[PDB]
Symmetry: C5
Amino acid sequence: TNVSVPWGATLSNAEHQLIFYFLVVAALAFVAGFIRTYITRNEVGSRYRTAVSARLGMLGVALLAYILIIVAFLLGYDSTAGGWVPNDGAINIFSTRYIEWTVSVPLLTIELLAVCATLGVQARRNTAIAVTATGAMIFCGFLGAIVIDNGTNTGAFILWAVISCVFWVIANVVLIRAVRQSLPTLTPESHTMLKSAAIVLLAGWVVYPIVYFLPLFGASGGLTTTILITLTVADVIVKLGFSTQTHRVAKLRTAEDVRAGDDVHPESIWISSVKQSDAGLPREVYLA
Amino acid sequence: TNVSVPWGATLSNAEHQLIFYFLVVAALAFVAGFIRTYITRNEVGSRYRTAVSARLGMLGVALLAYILIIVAFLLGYDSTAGGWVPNDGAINIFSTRYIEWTVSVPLLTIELLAVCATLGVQARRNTAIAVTATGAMIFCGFLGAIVIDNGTNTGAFILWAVISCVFWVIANVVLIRAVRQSLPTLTPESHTMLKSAAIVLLAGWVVYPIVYFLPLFGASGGLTTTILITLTVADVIVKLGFSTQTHRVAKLRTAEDVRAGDDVHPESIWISSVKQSDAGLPREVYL
Amino acid sequence: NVSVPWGATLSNAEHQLIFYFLVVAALAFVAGFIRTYITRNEVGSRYRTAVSARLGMLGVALLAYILIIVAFLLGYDSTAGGWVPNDGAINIFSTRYIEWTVSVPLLTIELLAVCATLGVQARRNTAIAVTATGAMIFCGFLGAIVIDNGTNTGAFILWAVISCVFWVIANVVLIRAVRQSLPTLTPESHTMLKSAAIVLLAGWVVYPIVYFLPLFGASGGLTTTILITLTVADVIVKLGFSTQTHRVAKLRTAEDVRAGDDVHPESIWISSVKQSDAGLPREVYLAE
Amino acid sequence: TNVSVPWGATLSNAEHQLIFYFLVVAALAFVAGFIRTYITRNEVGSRYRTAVSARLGMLGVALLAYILIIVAFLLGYDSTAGGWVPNDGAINIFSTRYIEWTVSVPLLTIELLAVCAGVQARRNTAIAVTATGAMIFCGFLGAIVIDNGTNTGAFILWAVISCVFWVIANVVLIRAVRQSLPTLTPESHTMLKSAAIVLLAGWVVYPIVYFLPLFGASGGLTTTILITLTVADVIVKLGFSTQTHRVAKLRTAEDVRAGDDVHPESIWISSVKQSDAGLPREVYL
Amino acid sequence: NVSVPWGATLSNAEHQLIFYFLVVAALAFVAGFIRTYITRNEVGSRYRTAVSARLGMLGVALLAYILIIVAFLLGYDSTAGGWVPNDGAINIFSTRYIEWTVSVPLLTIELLAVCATLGVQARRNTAIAVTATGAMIFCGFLGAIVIDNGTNTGAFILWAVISCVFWVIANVVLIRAVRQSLPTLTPESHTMLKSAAIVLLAGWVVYPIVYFLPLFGASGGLTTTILITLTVADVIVKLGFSTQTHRVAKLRTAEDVRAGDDVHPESIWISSVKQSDAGLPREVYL
Ligand SMILES: *C/C=C(C)/C=C/C=C(C)/C=C/C1=C(C)CCCC1(C)C
Ligand SMILES: *C/C=C(C)/C=C/C=C(C)/C=C/C1=C(C)CCCC1(C)C
Ligand SMILES: *C/C=C(C)/C=C/C=C(C)/C=C/C1=C(C)CCCC1(C)C
Ligand SMILES: *C/C=C(C)/C=C/C=C(C)/C=C/C1=C(C)CCCC1(C)C
Ligand SMILES: *C/C=C(C)/C=C/C=C(C)/C=C/C1=C(C)CCCC1(C)C
């Protein structure tokens, strides 16, 4: 049992405050993001609408999830003379974040695949692999960290982490292939953006596995705090800052389809205060 | 008596965690689905809007229902240090799922019937039968499993299950007939989709009856866990993965009506990244 | 003495059934509310009052039934196979009255909206119906719950009689409005409105009947019958009957389109049969 | 004479039920109103949209406010042998309504001023908002804040100060209506005047209910005060809400008929068509 | 050494006033949020970022003030001496920081969005402003609450100074962005942006001032002043100032319409004066 469960460490009043601060800030940040995404939903064409639906979903899930995390945090610790002593529900705080990831990660995959121009059959199978892979990845981590022996078995904590890494590789491969296959077809401007979005979205992922193995280096009120805050900052940075990257690709791809004369969009599309497309209406049709 | 109520079995800390995980994940999955369905609502024409309304409703019901299920689970169990001992309200967890099905299943019927080209009163009669049948199917199961003798009576548990199966057959027949009657009128591409949707939507149903009869083979923390999780996974797989099927049919049927020149749609309709219809605006009218 | 229903003890089976129907009802309204909202632009500006009223009714019902459910959960205490009523049990019955007070009046407006009543004639009718319906429920509430904690037989009867007076006033005005409008409407519209009017008003009888049941004694079974019957009645009326009014509005909209009186942006379909074709208002060049 | 705080009176089980009934009914009535206002938001042009925004806001504030009032009522009283005995939180019920008025009243001003006709319009809005805001705050200070509302002197003094603000508000609005009436069409002229009169008249009820506690305290009086205010809030904030909207719609239809601007959908008032549907002329850039 | 405000006992009158302003504020935001949402299509696609930012800020404020209200209700206990602070009283002050952490940054984006800085320069400007404003509040939270439960006078001041450094960085970038954009804008537009920039930035001073009040001692009256003043400040800025940014966007939209740069579906009206007439995009063949 070389594993030192983080929900066992007692927290200082200062630490307790910091965790709460970041958790709520995150939740509010998602509310702001969710609102933005919704209002800026018709800035994209019908073809890439799946990208908008996915991100809005991810943000929605994150908001509600972080509300549960906050609740668990409030019911997970009790105030004493020595600070905030963990109770039976403390484990729920860590558990809830996994739930978030289980649904959030898969949706991200779809978002990237949505902006990716993979056509017909190749695309459908890719989606299934990515979703199942990402879903399994988090489930394996949850099993090892929380489900098995109340996360007290050192070997499983590692074994399942390795199994998860397997899925992480499967996911990255499929996505990277899809991005690589689509890059040549896109315009130079589009090509650069997709690659940029793909790299930004996948890079951050490493932080999560790193934070997962931190408990092995021992237990501490400070460590527990670091684990929670780091993960929170990571969730916000990725699920928020990276959210715009996918959207931008969709918008440009939309404007390009307009300029190219492939389709007509109701409103002018602007990126970085530069006009990419002009407002257009479909030609009136007289039915038989 | 041979019936071993699942809400009587004690659950391990691991089991308790797993159940919670799947329940919440499911609820969140529905929120994501509900959001998607809403945003992708104008991708369909006015003719097949009933399909969109039904699915969004089903998802909405599921979301709220699973919230109740989750709450009951949290307020339905207590920790004894030997696991989680059921409260008097734990039965509510199982009860709530029935409530979900009672409202959710009927809406599904309407959704399939909506994509179906069955028109006139004959189709209206079909809707009434499907809804009433599906509604009764779940109610009969609820009566036997929970209402009668607090689910301690083996006779009712089975009798009512059989009565329910009767309704299940009535529902499947009407729906299958409606799909079969509509299939010939639809285009080849549309024909394939409806059949596909019909098969996928109806097939899964079998899982529910199977899980219902599991308690007869005894009671255990593991079994109780299997029952709950399996049903949850089933609900998500059907109410979600199967939801897209109906929507796609509606979109294509809309695009076809556009191409055929029968009707006009404001935006281009894309399926599988392949354009099915082009942007169109109705002719300006003078009075 | 009047045998108050909130005094009778309920079996575990009975308690479960009541909960089942209450929640199912609430969820049914959520499904209805969602449908009504999505299918709001299927109607013209002229009959929008009908849409606003139904969506309102459904919204009120949903929230109301949530309160009813809460009251039900806090109104009874478990005693090993039996549920003994507490001081809050009365609230369950009280809450339904609140629902009716707001819900019934909105229904009136909905029917009157689809009705062809023009000018003041229409406005006057609405005022009478709303005030009448509003008072009818209030009178019942006073006799059944407010006066002597609902234990006075004389008041229970007196106020019910007063209520019936208002019920007659309401039915008369509405029936007249429907009868006056039927001749002007098309055959297809005539059938729907008449059907809606008849369907909407007929069910009302059930409510008064259930009200006087307590007089014939008190029992766990009776109390169960009262609650469930009212719930089934609320759902059947507020839901199944909701479509009837909406359909009239849609057809009346399509008729206005075909007749060339007005233009609708999208095609209107009833029972899979096209009633109207998509039309756009003629572009106008303002003086500028 | 003597100020007798209403949150001191014990309430009967019957009284407790009545108050709950009206409070919830009111809240639900606002939900129904809020939904209607939202659905019937595009029935008005861009010029008078401030009227729609204001009313929807007022209704929204009222709904949430009445939710707090209901909560306070549930946590403000404890059930006893003699009925429902007030606790420390009972005062919150009365306090919450003031909060509602402080935000709700100002929005109403904007709504009427929105339908009303330049630069001096902005000044008028500032006066109305500040005046209305202060009027309620002054009453709050005297009735609740000062000496826990047990002082007859302030209860009256501050009421008088408030009345001063009430006069300022009514004057600005009355002037705005009077100044605008001549410019508007006869049909529009009648509407605005009608709306102005209906919106301002009711206000008197609030001050009247305020001074009732002076004539003593009782479970019945406390009940009368609460219910009357509730009925008043619903009647004004709801029935009166339509008045402003109608003016906006007609003024929109007039702009359409006159050819000044175009509206996408047909505008109907009293089951009578005011404007036929129109789309803006396609523009090349 | 620092007299924490959550240590002072409050009178029944004081307790009532704080509650009054807090709720009024929350409701004011609800009214604002509703208005902003309904008046979202009064602006063009080009300046939509401004609308998205303000609606977000208002949304955050509303929810935040709900938490502040809850904390206030669970932070004090009624006694014979008035309302005695408990362990949760500190949360009231803590929650406001959370609000500011998300609210302030969004404001920056809103002003920068109306600002015409083009290319990465605006994106670079955005990143600095967001991070600067974010850090500013975090530093204050650290010193006021996190460090020694706000009992260390040196930190209370040190971190305040560090924060002020960030405040200067933020003001500079924004002022530069406004100054750089001002020349490109029309005279009418130019005036509004400057006014909005000045109005948005000026108020900021109040917050730092209120922060250092606890140093001059602790009291039920002072605690009351701190809370109410901040609340009034939040509403006045986040609300009254919200319109300023929006108005600029609307005019800039109308100008683009008149100039023939873009087409807007509906007429745009500011102060009851028509700025742009309704226009529909030309139907296109593919
Ligand atoms: C929006 C949130 C995201 C993208 C979260 C991602 C999380 C991971 C990539 C987690 C991966 C893990 C491993 C590869 C090994 C250890 C267990 C996990 C689940 C933390
Ligand atoms: C979205 C959820 C769905 C479609 C659930 C379906 C459930 C059934 C088809 C249940 C059928 C049953 C029987 C035929 C016998 C035993 C009792 C039931 C209700 C489980
Ligand atoms: C959505 C619910 C509806 C339309 C409910 C209608 C209820 C009534 C018509 C009630 C009438 C009553 C009497 C005429 C006498 C006894 C008391 C009442 C209120 C139940
Ligand atoms: C929507 C609610 C409205 C318009 C409420 C209005 C309230 C008043 C006009 C109150 C006025 C008062 C006085 C003039 C004196 C006493 C104190 C007040 C605030 C009740
Ligand atoms: C919408 C709310 C706003 C803009 C709040 C602004 C707050 C500040 C400008 C705070 C600045 C501070 C310092 C510069 C020093 C002391 C600590 C702070 C955070 C209060």
